[PDB]
Ligand binder design. Structure first.
Ligand SMILES: [Mg+2]
Ligand SMILES: [Mg+2]
Lengths: 384, 388
């Protein structure tokens, strides 16, 4: 049916979320995540001031046409703000389509390819032992996979961290050796290098950690230049993951087609929604590349519900990141996905199974918060 | 000197502009264009809510560090909203540095490479004849180059919400060569003639057109095909020697690195306000120069006099300058943005005032409230949402 109303909701139940809600003339509604961490109000404005008014009166069933209308119609294509706005609309429209079909989203997409969706948890410590304790506690929660991180020896506005590549490189292998010593070989172990290396440095790290058989080594190098992955891929057999900072298939087409990565990390709310990410996943599948959606707290339960539905259907699923939201957040975004024994189970309610309690949301006003920056020991502004 | 204040100014003296002003503890100020046509408030919010607060107290002289701080620090990199915000800061900081150095921006950049900067004018008509009359009017004004567009038998942001146009590729391909033939027939060979295909063709269609217009020796054929996939240019380049221009919709060197390195284009069109400012555009221009590629900055009304003045300075220094688009701003716009660049005999002359030579009259700017205006969309005859 026709779109009668559309508007954003901004709320901060432990952290900032922006949500787009679309309401048809029949009263059926859908919501989509529009949260872009540290730049939230840019997306809110992109929506409120430019997209939202153009949605009014459109046929809500025309998902593809609306995607193209917003993507091409913007004239200025791609980008974090642009593609997050588009994702929010797309996610809301799929929510409405699934409701109209009377099916949970995963059925609409082609049905379930699996009975449960494997997640990984974050295990972080100041020391290696601190980290190991976190691994133990997540293993007990039923997690089959853990991302491990420990300190390297030696906020409203961005916090400023200090970084040393060489100290990190000499130290990191010790962490994975420790994990394997304590927990053995069955456990999937992931590591996020978080953009801090050059390609030949990452190649060195990849080789160094081969004996520990990592599930992936993530975001080795900044990849605006996709060729950056080539030296890494040519020098190590440690699996590679990338893409949480991407927003377009055009950010990763070459990475995938040249087989320079094993996992694509771009999530629904930043990658143009269901419509676009279906195309990204399908391109990946031609090259044995699997999905590994970014799943931090800064993607709302709306994205997570939609992602679990997507994960349930997509043939080339790899893994789903899990960073639990706060109780307050979960309360603001009632949902029917559930977590059991290290895995998500998709909801059965028509739609993506997530809603937003607007009354509750209104109790948590926006509070500005920025991501940190990283500087080298000489002060050079680096990659965080 | 530290940044004491920073804030945006929104004004609509004939069309919308967003401007960033940065004021240092000494009271010296600098401005930068932040205008993103049809999405203006997204950049205003990006600046107001997330960038401006972080600028206070920063060393205004650290242009490079601030660029990297905003680019890398945002975590989410590239994009039209993102890079336009960064460009506004960068442009304002270069303005302040030039003022501090007591020289016009072109001097700071390495000095004058030319005595004047050639422009082209927009010439449009419903009929070929109408267009030819516009060509004549502009040659009399002293323009040495013209971009020609006419109707196909069978201020772009002109509506609050997007207008919907209808398009036929086949009709355009059959018609366009007739326009150029007529232009050459009437005006001869000396005149530079440009044409903007404006994203509508597939590569083999653009290859066909490029070949068809070879006899008319166009200065460039612009935006033949959407180029998110940079490989899109390859078939065109392999099939025609008509020169190619691309990039007004780009915001990053990573949007055009392969285009340039493979020699698939002759002119790069990404302008200062959308391509991350002077800092980023120096690097793009320099990459281009290795491959004989020249600058052809987008210069529509929707880039403010602030951008234009800085662009004219940039154009004056950059060795691999190609041409500067000129779409004249309204008298009201020129009044809100006093500037010392001048247009004479088809060319721009850079100003001599320290800074980029442009300022904003805030009192006058406040007299023209924001008015939403959207770019049109384009649909094929069957209703397919196409490229405008
Ligand atoms: Mg990560
Ligand atoms: Mg153009």
């Amino acid at each position: 049916l026709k779109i009668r109303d559309a508007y954003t909701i901004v709320t901060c139940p432990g952290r900032n979320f922006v949500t787009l809600k679309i309401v048809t003339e029949s009263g059926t509604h859908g919501i989509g995540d529009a949260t872009l961490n540290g730049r939230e109000m840019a997306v809110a404005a992109y929506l409120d001031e430019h997209v939202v008014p153009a949605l009014i009166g459109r046929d809500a069933g025309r998902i593809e046409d609306t995607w193209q209308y917003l993507y091409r119609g913007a004239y200025w294509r791609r980008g974090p703000v642009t593609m997050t706005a588009i994702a929010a609309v797309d996610m809301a429209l799929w929510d409405i389509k699934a409701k109209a079909a009377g099916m949970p989203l995963y059925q609409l997409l082609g049905g379930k390819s699996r009975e449960r969706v494997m997640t990984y948890a974050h295990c972080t410590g100041q020391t290696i032992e601190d980290c190991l304790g976190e691994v133990a506690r997540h293993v007990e929660l039923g997690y089959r996979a853990v991302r491990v991180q420990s300190g390297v020896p030696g906020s409203s506005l961005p916090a400023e961290h200090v970084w040393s590549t060489e100290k990190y490189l000499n130290h990191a292998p010790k962490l994975f050796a420790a994990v394997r010593e304590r927990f053995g070989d069955d456990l999937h172990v992931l590591h996020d290098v978080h953009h801090r290396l050059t390609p030949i440095e990452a190649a060195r790290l990849g080789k160094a950690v081969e004996p520990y058989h990592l599930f992936w080594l993530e975001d080795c190098v900044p990849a605006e230049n996709q060729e950056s992955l080539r030296l890494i891929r040519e020098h190590t057999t440690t699996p590679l993951a990338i893409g949480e900072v991407f927003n377009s298939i055009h950010d990763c087409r070459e990475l995938i087609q040249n087989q320079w990565i094993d996992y694509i990390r771009m999530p629904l709310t930043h990658g143009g929604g269901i419509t676009a990410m279906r195309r990204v996943a399908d391109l990946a599948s031609l090259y044995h590349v699997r999905t590994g959606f970014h799943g931090p707290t800064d993607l709302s339960p709306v994205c997570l519900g939609a992602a679990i539905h997507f994960d349930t259907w997509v043939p080339n699923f790899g893994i789903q990141e899990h960073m639990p939201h706060t109780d307050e957040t979960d309360a603001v975004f009632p949902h029917d996905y559930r977590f059991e024994d290290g895995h998500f189970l998709a909801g059965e309610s028509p739609g993506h199974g997530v809603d937003i309690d607007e009354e509750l949301a209104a109790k948590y006003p926006y509070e500005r918060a920025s991501l940190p920056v990283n500087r080298l020991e000489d002060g050079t502004l680096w990659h965080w």
